[PDB]
Design an enzyme around this catalytic site. Structure first.
Site, PDB file in Angstrom:
ATOM      1  N   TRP A 130     122.678  49.675  34.755  1.00  0.00           N
ATOM      2  CA  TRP A 130     122.410  48.456  34.023  1.00  0.00           C
ATOM      3  C   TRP A 130     121.326  47.673  34.782  1.00  0.00           C
ATOM      4  O   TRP A 130     121.522  47.261  35.927  1.00  0.00           O
ATOM      5  CB  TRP A 130     123.719  47.660  33.894  1.00  0.00           C
ATOM      6  CG  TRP A 130     123.607  46.385  33.130  1.00  0.00           C
ATOM      7  CD1 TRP A 130     122.998  46.195  31.914  1.00  0.00           C
ATOM      8  CD2 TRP A 130     124.058  45.104  33.558  1.00  0.00           C
ATOM      9  NE1 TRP A 130     123.033  44.866  31.572  1.00  0.00           N
ATOM     10  CE2 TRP A 130     123.680  44.173  32.563  1.00  0.00           C
ATOM     11  CE3 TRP A 130     124.736  44.647  34.692  1.00  0.00           C
ATOM     12  CZ2 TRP A 130     123.960  42.812  32.674  1.00  0.00           C
ATOM     13  CZ3 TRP A 130     125.012  43.293  34.801  1.00  0.00           C
ATOM     14  CH2 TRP A 130     124.623  42.390  33.797  1.00  0.00           C
ATOM     15  N   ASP A 211     132.037  47.332  39.371  1.00  0.00           N
ATOM     16  CA  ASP A 211     131.590  46.529  38.243  1.00  0.00           C
ATOM     17  C   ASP A 211     132.398  47.124  37.080  1.00  0.00           C
ATOM     18  O   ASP A 211     132.105  48.231  36.596  1.00  0.00           O
ATOM     19  CB  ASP A 211     130.091  46.691  38.015  1.00  0.00           C
ATOM     20  CG  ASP A 211     129.567  45.787  36.915  1.00  0.00           C
ATOM     21  OD1 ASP A 211     129.187  44.632  37.186  1.00  0.00           O
ATOM     22  OD2 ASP A 211     129.516  46.238  35.766  1.00  0.00           O
ATOM     23  N   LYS A 246     133.877  42.868  26.169  1.00  0.00           N
ATOM     24  CA  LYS A 246     134.013  43.988  25.245  1.00  0.00           C
ATOM     25  C   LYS A 246     135.425  44.280  24.785  1.00  0.00           C
ATOM     26  O   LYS A 246     135.720  44.193  23.600  1.00  0.00           O
ATOM     27  CB  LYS A 246     133.412  45.264  25.837  1.00  0.00           C
ATOM     28  CG  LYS A 246     132.063  45.632  25.266  1.00  0.00           C
ATOM     29  CD  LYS A 246     130.961  44.716  25.781  1.00  0.00           C
ATOM     30  CE  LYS A 246     130.670  44.955  27.257  1.00  0.00           C
ATOM     31  NZ  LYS A 246     131.134  43.857  28.157  1.00  0.00           N
TER      32      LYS A 246
END
Ligand SMILES: CC[C@@H](NCc1c(COP(=O)(O)O)cnc(C)c1O)C(=O)O
Ligand SMILES: CC[C@@H](NCc1c(COP(=O)(O)O)cnc(C)c1O)C(=O)O
EC number: 2.6.1.1
Lengths: 396, 396
Positions: A130, A211, A246
């Site tokens: 990312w 993460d 999410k």
């Protein structure tokens, strides 16, 4: 003083939709936005959160400030979700959790913590990973070093290259993992690989920084925590930045946590006080709404059950879209073989398209995708799958 | 790596309530918490926001991410609230607004902007001033220099000392003002003083940075903007960090804005893109809830009217508590004279108590207050005013 400011370049992801939102083209598919979309191509607000918001609307009697660390029930719940129930580090009181504005604010919070309260200079992010990871770490003054990851050929996790690249990392360095659903490869370590990575980690003495943003999207809430759990079992200290954006559809409410695991209650409090200090200087206290919606949903068994079902509908839908994608391509007609796609977790996967192909697609076919050739599977519906694969096969 | 971390010292304000919440003492008054409390000593959620939340709960169909700058209607409204309607800088398009997690996140955002995109090294905060100002600016790597302010004797604004102290500040330096209701003195510049401060500011070439958090608490939404408006009229560039935490009772939802005023549309866009860059690395996007509650309340005339009335009930209540306080003290019996209190705006005022007196109070009388002798008037009710003044007079 602003007359000479350099105009910032466009973000690799945002600058995609920002343009998408301009290309009238009828049939314009979009595979950028790492945001979930149902069979209708809509990002709805889960029912559970909808119910939680009504409860809140009725019961909230005040908006008065939260503690710097946020909502207690929130931290407690995320703890149990991550480390498990009856997990030592929970019972021992070796962890402390702080509510932050999304998983990114948890990162920025870890960073600033580390950056001013420790002898950390480098962070090891995978390749790829990312994009915003580097920007975040750099903004804190930390250095980012990439360790190899993707086997561009076999479309798999190159453990060898990884270890070999990781060995150069010194002790007292932060190595950043992805708990599950690796952005953007979708390839995740096996438990075995994870288990060894946890051993070699204590030896070389890295400082883990997981993460975790897609818990529940690979195989389920618990299975997805095997990794963080393997390290947690081995290390005396670690940090974890989780996000509820999410698995809860709470994207714009910015809800996440930064969990500090130290060697004992006595020090975890000391280390945390400084963390709170970083926060107080950044945003003061976190936003209560999204976090409240999460504490209540998780502390209530009726609501948790509904939610826990919604998450799996999402998870299951993306997995239907993976194999539908493989089959459809294999159907339209040509030499290829995207079977590897079926092996990748999460919402993303590496298309394996050249920067060129990707432009032929998003300009001759309006099918949008990120330059890297990353495609958001959770943006595929049974109704767009046809023209989509037509575009793709056409650019092979 | 955490075994040697230094335990952070307690924040001058928080560490007050955190202890308050432990002193059982029946009759325990609390004057720290710069949070508003009605005649019942309760911090309710305004009706207008309550109505706005129902509307939201019903209409929101998605939680999908906001732009890095937040909600458009939000920025537009705050603009008109600050600069006025038909204000040149609005019509010219010289300003850009970004929604941030409260007024503090706006500060941190201005800071990081400045810190990495300009030749700014120092910031000039008054003396005294909200403690967290320094911590915030320092976390960005900027230097904080104090310019004199309070006339400890006459209990007034020492314009002379101020100017005299400000002159040492060089050009290209950031001077930070308080739009209204100066924390913690309550003393604010007159329009005349403001008007000159705006002249001497262009000459010496400082870069204004207004911290506007109590708009509507001195004399009303418009009157309270005279200052920011005086500078805005004179400068080609400025920055303003506003907060909706108080005038909207939205404390824990973290809602505020960072408005960049540049010399022209063309550059304000350039300067803003870099600002967005800072944000993206900090928290990504802002929290939608509290901001949505504010956009709708302000863009709807029925709701704005109710809200606009609630704000004045608050404003009016604090002003009743000021003179009740003066009268009551003057009643209990003794040499003194707190008439100056009636001249100070906002929720705070400088008691004029020695650090010692303050401890005699919050330990022999449980009456809590901040070491500086700052007292939150908006925490005084007609029912606690008696024992309160008894405590005070007793320690004179
Ligand atoms: C911001 C959306 C981005 N994924 C968000 C994201 C985050 C934190 O995002 P959050 O702050 O919204 O929790 C952390 N970590 C990864 C690996 C992410 O992909 C994407 O396009 O993949
Ligand atoms: C945090 C409470 C503090 N006043 C909050 C506050 C802020 C920003 O706070 P916000 O982020 O919550 O908008 C900015 N500026 C001043 C001068 C303040 O007093 C006080 O005790 O006075």
């Amino acid at each position: 003083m602003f007359e000479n400011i350099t105009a910032a370049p466009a973000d690799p992801i945002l600058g995609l939709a920002d343009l998408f939102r301009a290309d009238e083209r009828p049939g314009k598919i979009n595979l950028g936005i790492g945001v979930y979309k149902d069979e209708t191509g809509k990002t709805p607000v889960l029912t559970s959160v909808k119910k939680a918001e009504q409860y809140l609307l009725e019961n909230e009697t005040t908006k008065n400030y939260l503690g710097i660390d946020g909502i207690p029930e929130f931290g407690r719940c995320t703890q149990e979700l991550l480390f498990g129930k009856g997990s030592a580090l929970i019972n021992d009181k070796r962890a402390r959790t702080a509510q932050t504005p999304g998983g990114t604010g948890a990162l920025r919070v870890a960073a600033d913590f580390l950056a001013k309260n420790t002898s950390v200079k480098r962070v090891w992010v995978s390749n790829p990973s990312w994009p915003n990871h580097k920007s975040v770490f750099n903004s804190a003054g930390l250095e980012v070093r990439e360790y190899a990851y993707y086997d561009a050929e076999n479309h798999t996790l190159d453990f060898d290259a990884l270890i070999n690249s990781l060995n150069e990392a010194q002790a007292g360095d932060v190595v950043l993992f992805h708990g599950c659903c690796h952005n953007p490869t979708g390839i995740d370590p096996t438990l075995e690989q994870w288990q060894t990575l946890a051993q070699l980690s204590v030896e070389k003495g890295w400082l883990p920084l997981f993460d975790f943003a897609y818990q529940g999207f690979a195989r389920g809430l618990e299975e997805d925590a095997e990794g963080l759990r393997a390290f947690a079992a081995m290390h005396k200290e670690l940090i974890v930045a989780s996000s509820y954006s999410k698995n809860f559809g709470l994207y714009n409410e910015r809800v996440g946590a930064c969990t500090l695991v130290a060697a004992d209650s006595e020090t975890v409090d000391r280390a945390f006080s400084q963390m709170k200090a970083a926060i107080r200087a950044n945003y003061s206290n976190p936003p209560a709404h999204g976090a409240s919606v999460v504490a209540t949903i998780l502390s209530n068994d009726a609501l948790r059950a509904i939610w826990e079902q919604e998450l799996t509908d999402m998870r299951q839908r993306i997995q239907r879209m993976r194999q539908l994608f493989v089959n459809t391509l294999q159907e339209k007609g040509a030499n290829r073989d995207f079977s590897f796609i079926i092996k990748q977790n999460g919402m993303f996967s590496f298309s394996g398209l050249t920067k060129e192909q990707v432009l032929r697609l998003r300009e001759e076919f309006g099918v949008y995708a990120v330059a890297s050739g990353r495609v958001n599977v959770a943006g595929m519906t049974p109704d767009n799958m046809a023209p989509l694969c037509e575009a793709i096969v056409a650019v092979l």
